Structure formats: structure tokens, C-alpha cells
């Protein structure tokens with residue numbers, strides 16, 4: 001299983017200036033829950049934006065050029081990234097935009113957080129489509145103290 005996980009604001013915006021500007025702790029907790037113990041594949045820009053390894057997960061970074069940090073695994077292409085994950089049930093792809101574009105045709109599951117927020121955005125989630133996917137999970141939550149915007153968690157299976 002190749003799965004993508006992403007948090008999208010309105011108009012499918014996922015980032016700006018190579019950052020996530022919004023602070024939504026409930027969604028981070030959901031991200032950790034759904035990636036714990038799994039391999040995670042990310043692009044080099046996302047690597048520099050998170051800034052650090054992610055604990056309890058095998059961190060795989062796509063980059064066309066020599067890696068600079070042996071606390072993670074560097075790979076030069078998509079199939080190399082897949083091979084490096086070994087024999088895991090579920091391979092999590094955690095972005096960013098250019099990497100999501102390449103892995104979407106090979107994914108069978110999408111973990112999406114739809115955030116009710118407008119964010120001027122430098123990068124977007126790939127434009128998917130009304131008919132390749134059906135929902136297996138809905139969980140909507142209003143804004144509270146720690147979380148300033150409402151958000152929907154959705155899991156989608158490739159039909």
C-alpha cells in the first residue's frame with residue numbers, strides 16, 4: 001500500500017514560502033497517529049521545512065543530488081524510494097507538492113485534512129477528481145481553544 005497524507009486549506013493550498021503557516025495541533029496528532037511505525041517518503045524541500053528527522057519512522061528523502069545527513073535515507077528516484085521501504089504493508093508519502101504529484105497514480109489511499117482556512121499559497125495538492133475515489137471515513141471538528149479553524153479528517157480509498 002502506497003498512501004498519501006496531507007493537510008489542505010481552501011483551494012488545495014498546502015504551503016507558502018516552504019512553510020505551513022497555520023498551527024493546528026489536533027491535525028499534527030492525527031499525522032503522528034497515522035504515520036507511527038511506518039516509512040515516510042518526502043521531498044527535499046519538505047525535509048528542510050520540517051527541519052529534523054521524524055521519530056519512530058524510517059525517513060526517506062527524494063533528492064537528485066548527494067544527501068548531507070546520515071540520520072535519514074537518501075534516494076535518487078521514485079522506485080528507489082519504494083524499494084528502500086522494504087517489506088512494509090503501508091508506505092506513507094508526506095509531500096510536498098511535486099512528490100505528491102508523482103505518487104498519486106500509485107496510491108490506493110488518501111488521508112486528507114480539509115482545513116477551513118484561506119491561505120495565500122505557493123504550492124497546491126494535485127488536482128484530483130470526482131470519480132477515482134470514495135470516502136471510507138469522515139470526522140468533522142469545530143474550532144476550539146488549541147485549534148483555531150475547523151477541520152475535517154477524511155480517508156479515501158481508490159475505487
Ligand SMILES: NC(=O)c1ccc[n+]([C@@H]2O[C@H](COP(=O)([O-])OP(=O)(O)OC[C@H]3O[C@@H](n4cnc5c(N)ncnc54)[C@H](OP(=O)(O)O)[C@@H]3O)[C@@H](O)[C@H]2O)c1
Nearest residue numbers: 007014015018019043044045046063064095096097098099
Ligand atoms: N499541507 C501539507 O500537508 C504539506 C505536506 C508536505 C509539504 N508541505 C509544504 O509543501 C511545500 C514543499 O513542497 P514542494 O513541491 O516545493 O517540494 P517537495 O515535493 O517537498 O520536494 C521537491 C524536491 O524533492 C526532490 N524530488 C522530487 N521528486 C524527485 C524525484 N523523482 N527524484 C529525485 N528527487 C526528487 C527534488 O530534490 P532536489 O531539488 O534536491 O533534487 C525536488 O527538488 C512546503 O511549502 C511544505 O510546507 C505541505
Ligand SMILES: Nc1nc(=O)c2nc(CNc3ccc(C(=O)N[C@@H](CCC(=O)O)C(=O)O)cc3)cnc2[nH]1
Nearest residue numbers: 005006007027028029031032050054055094095113
Ligand atoms: N495531515 C497532515 N498534516 C500536516 O501538518 C502534515 N504536514 C506534513 C509535512 N510537515 C510536517 C511538519 C511537522 C511535523 C511534526 O512535527 N510532527 C510531529 C508531531 C508530534 C506531536 O503531535 O506531538 C510528529 O512526530 O509527527 C510533521 C510534518 C505532511 N503531511 C501532513 N499531513
